[PDB]
Write a protein that binds this ligand. Sequence first.
Ligand code: GDP
Ligand code: MG
Length: 448
Amino acid sequence: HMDFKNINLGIFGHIDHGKTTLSKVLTEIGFSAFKLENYRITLVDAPGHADLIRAVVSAADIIDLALIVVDAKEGPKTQTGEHMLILDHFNIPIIVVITKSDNAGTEEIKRTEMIMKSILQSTHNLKNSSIIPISAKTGFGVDELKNLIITTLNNAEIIRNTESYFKMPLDHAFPIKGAGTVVTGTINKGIVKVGDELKVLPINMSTKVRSIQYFKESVMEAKAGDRVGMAIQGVDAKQIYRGCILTSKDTKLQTVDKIVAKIKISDIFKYNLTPKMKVHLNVGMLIVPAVAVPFKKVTFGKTEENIILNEVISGNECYCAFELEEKVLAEVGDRVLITRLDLPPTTLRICGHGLIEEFKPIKDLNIKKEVLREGKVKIDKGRTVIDGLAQSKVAAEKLIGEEISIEGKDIVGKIKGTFGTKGLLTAEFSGNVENRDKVILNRLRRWG
Ligand SMILES: Nc1nc2c(ncn2[C@@H]2O[C@H](COP(=O)(O)OP(=O)(O)O)[C@@H](O)[C@H]2O)c(=O)[nH]1
Ligand SMILES: [Mg+2]
């Protein structure tokens, strides 16, 4: 017959907004799927709030399209917001579906519609995404929703990665007996054939593939993007839990403690740069408490330094050094999601996102502090003094023999002397120094 294309469709939104009902309506035309044209569409499914999060963080590669449901009457709520954010960070095309249109008047629907438009405009990659009102109970606009899903899937670039090592997470695990186990999950990268030797991580065992179940059918081979059941031998299902990963033996996957990421910030005004910060880091399918130290990479003309962030977010660099409390499975280039989930569900919980550049500890990053002390130039008759670099004779004495520049005048000087008990100094300059001049003291420090 005709060649099918395998699609994974996520469904997101606040609870009671009609996620489940929409899913059921879609599935009638574990594993729950439906067909549109030649698209085989498997629903990415988790019960709710944090589960969808854990689902996207891990499965982002293979999630082609997402439906974000919003009640017509009460409009966007918090969870709608965080789902929107997450989907924006991971660059997943979305359709905004306004549910329960039968329970709302035209005016209300148009209102919510416009609110959603305004919201969509505040996002990077979701900037304009089509919005349809529907009623899953009534069937209102559902046909149009299907046609739209088709159009969107037609436009979006769907890249399945076969070429790399086989990489799949494990959602569920069923023992049969001591000699066998069945796991279920969607393949991220690579290819599997029946009778292959793979491994479970972090526990690092070695198992063989007995059976591949795809689309309620047995197949010899599965590919990335396919959501499959798999029977494997050499493991009991008690050892396999929420964070386990089945992968080939050529794998680049590592069990990691320290993670260095390149971080993009979601909302600038809600974001804060105070270093050594306690957050919840989403990596793969887990969420591990973590400590973060924001820093930027500066080229001084000879050596590249990693300097603690100057609190300026101008320029997009926010390399974060993360130290994790627990372990995690990661690869270089994996999308990582910084959340604060300690906060109540009532407020937006996303503290960032970013690509893992290196697995490295802070101590080896040679972290440094940019050090600037500013003081003025007071000149009485015949004598030049610098004020404000030191608050006492002790500190003033500590400063002797440093490098100092004068602002905007392009003039260099060294500070030799220490004047008075109040911390005044004396310095050697190139000539043409004037009263009330600006002195910048510049040096590199050991941070923390
Ligand atoms: N009138 C109407 N009610 C709906 C529609 N979709 C869902 N509901 C109702 O909303 C309630 C909860 O929706 P649900 O499917 O559980 O959404 P979820 O909890 O976010 O997955 C149920 O009692 C449904 O009857 C709709 O299109 N029209
Ligand atoms: Mg539900």
